[model samples]
Target: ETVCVTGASGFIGSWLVMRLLERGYTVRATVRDPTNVKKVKHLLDLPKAETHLTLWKADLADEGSFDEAIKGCTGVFHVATPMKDPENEVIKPTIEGMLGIMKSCAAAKTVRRLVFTSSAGTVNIQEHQLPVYDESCWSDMEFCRAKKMTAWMYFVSKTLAEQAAWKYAKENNIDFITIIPTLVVGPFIMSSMPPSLITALSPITGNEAHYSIIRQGQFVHLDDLCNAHIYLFENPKAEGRYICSSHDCIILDLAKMLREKYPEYNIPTEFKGVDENLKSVCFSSKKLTDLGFEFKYSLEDMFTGAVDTCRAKGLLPPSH
Candidate 1:
């Protein structure tokens, strides 16, 4: 099988591309620059995996830019989305880019299905006394816009973009599946640690600012998240949205786990628990597991693997 994956160099996207290549699928991947060594180095270094992979330069803002990359492929993994940008700059590109990709996918008649990389951000995070959030929950855009905060703006972008994609896919009768992952944590096939992963090691790195939005301890391994995407794509019966989270707990729990594992590291011993954050909401991954997709990593495995991987990459000092 052949497939196209957008944002193939990103944290989750890169791993998805690697998995596709490992499975012997011909993969056409999109990147802003195919020549940039830092961005494409890890991909190029995949031994014997290069035969099945191809890189294409495509920008999300340019309409129909995805046509060539997506053409002749049987499936597409639309995983590219702007992470942080001003309101004016972020909204249009996200919505418009997703729509453009849908159009290109439609034009490429060979494409049978598309798996969208949505986020848990699409689910509302406000203080609510309600049932556990599943695929049905949507972040309150009106509430987000009212706040006018930059953080809220990013969340709103994800919410609006995912909503738009669903509307377009439904009207066009496209076979689409949305994979929403929460606080993805695990080893990445990159030379340096990503900012998102850094936030998880805040206790040792002293990067508290990155920990601001990490109040909820909901987490999923990168492998599990990527597998969820492939599982949804390969399973003919798979439909609708799936929340891909392995575990849920308070932020302090993660800190404690890391501290216990690497006692020499300066990990925080005391931190607020979920009891203090009454507004926090838990999520359900039963929908994913019910479909016969079992998550292999536990929360402990996630932190241990992440720290070990970071240390191996020289991101941290050797363990004492």
Candidate 2:
């Protein structure tokens, strides 16, 4: 199958591209600057990847930018979206960017299904008495925006963009599937560390928000996330949204897992057993597993892979 992956140079995007190429699919990858060594250098360096891969220049804000990329492709992986911006800046680009791509895909005769990368942010973040969530849950955009919080802006972007994509796909009779991953972690195909990995090494970096989320212990491995994307695209019966998470636990447990594996690094010495605000926190991947899909990496496996990769890349100091 011929497919196009937007933001193919990004962390997860690169992994998707690599896996797609490995699967023998002809991959067309979109990037802002194909010539920039730093941005796309890793992709270019992929092992024997160039033979089956092509790079096209694209930007989310530009209308019709993706028309060329989507042409002649049966499917697309719309994985890139703006993050960390003011409310207006982030929201505008996401909604507009997604609609723009959808329009192009709709116009293309060969395009069949579009696998979109949504986030856990699309679901309500509140602690439920049952502490359970799935694709059926959606974040309250009104509440997120009303608080006037900067981080909430990112959530708003994902929520609104996903909603818009679904409405457009439904009205136009386009086949689409959305994958919502919770805190992706694992070895990146790229040499440089992505935010997820950076946050995994949070104790060394002191990123409070990443650290806090890690403590929540909800995460999906990068490879598992990529596998879910491909599975949805290939499965004729797959439809709607799927929540992909391999593990969810308390912070102290996660910290202990890391400390046990990587004793050389500084792990959190103390942590609350679990937040009183959460009696339990859980999400169901039964929808995915029911499809005969299985996760390859556990939380401990992901942490080990992430730590080793980061250390090898010199992002972390070698154990003395």
Candidate 3:
């Protein structure tokens, strides 16, 4: 089998590319510039990359840019969407880029399935009291916009882009599977830390800005999340949206986990934005688990793996 992974140099993209190559599949990984040493050097050094991996230059917002890469592939992992933007900037590029990717997939005769990386942030907004955020739930765009929610533009971008893909896939009769992973934790494939990992490590690093986002959170490990993507793609019955989260922990518990696990950095005793009285909602993965999938990493395991990798990459400081 052969596949193309867009944004193949990104944190998740690089991991997926590595996983595919390890599985003996020929991989065509799309990057902005294949010659960029920092972006693709890690991927080039992965297992079996020499024989199985190929890099292609692609611009997400440009139509026909991805057609060449997807031409001979059996499947695709459309993982990239532009994220650095304001509300107006984020929405158009993400939605339009998604359409262009799907169009390329549609034109590629061999494309049998497409697995997309959607965010967990897509469904967590609450204008009022809310309990479960199951696969059925979608965030209220107006509420998020009106309240100026945390990374609201990003949430809106993911939610709308995913819907646009769903509509396109349905209209074109393409097999599509979306993985709505929560704040993904665990080790890195790239030297640089990912935005989500930075937030997940906020309690330990005391990155004050991410306190609000991680105050009440659900998470999945990087390994577990990627495995979920492959599992859904291979399963014949896999369909619709699946929330890929595995664990939910308050900021206090996260701080405790880090403190107990590493005892290296000075973990915060109190998270400023956390409200103890606030209800922690279940970002259910029933739809995913119901398909016989099981999460293997505990929160502590995620932190340990993440910390070790970050420290080795020098993304974190030396132990005290």
Query: Highest lDDT, which number?
Result: 3
Task: Give the clashing residue pairs of candidate 2, or none.
Answer: none
TM-score of every prediction relative to native = 0.93, 0.94, 0.96
Candidate 1 C-alpha lDDT tens digits along 1-320:
88999998888889999888877789888998889898899887765455888889999888889999998989999999876346668887888888889899999988899999887778855545344778888887777777664367668877888899999999997888999988888888887686568777777786766665565657888998888898899989898999998887666766777778888788766655445554445679888888899998888887777888888989877654
Q: How well is each residue in 1-320 modelled by candidate 2, as lDDT tens digits? A: 89999989899999999898888899999998888888787787776566888899999988999999999999999999876346567888899999989899988878999999998888855433247788889987777767754368778888889999999999998898999998898888677778777766675555666665655657899999999999999998998899999888766667667678777767766654455354435768889999989999998778778877888888778663
Return the top candidate by TM-score.
3
- Displacement of the residue 143 alpha carbon in candidate 1, Å: 2.3
Stretches of model 3 off by over 4 angstroms after superposition: 273-275
Clashes of each: 0, 0, 0
The total of clashing pairs for model 1 equals 0
Candidate 3 structure quality by residue, lDDT tens digits, 52-106: 9988999876778999999988889988988744755788888888888878888
Model 2 Cα RMSD, 1 decimal:
2.1
